[PDB]
Design a binder for these strands. Structure first.
Length: 49
DNA sequence: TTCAACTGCTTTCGCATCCCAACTACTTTTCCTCACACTTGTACTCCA
């Protein structure tokens, strides 16, 4: 998966497929990120009100 | 001096049995159109 191609000249189909793998690894991490810090701040602000 | 159930909490707006009907039947509603049995003379002779 070492892409020697550049976006100016376009990338080959093998290295097009690996670059779609790196494009989905960030989008799946947002998909596991539903509700994280909304209840941490509520617990602090109720005591420290 | 510990095991095991009862325990409230993850966000931030807005999105998002009874009834009905089918078709074919049979029937009622009545009103209209005539016949079927009875009877006295008259006719054709009947017996006097």
């Amino acid at each position: 998966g070492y892409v020697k191609g550049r976006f100016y000249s376009g990338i080959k189909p093998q290295e097009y497929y690996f670059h779609c793998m790196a494009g989905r690894e960030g989008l799946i991490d947002t998909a596991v990120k539903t509700s994280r810090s909304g209840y941490l701040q509520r617990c602090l602000t109720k005591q420290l009100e």
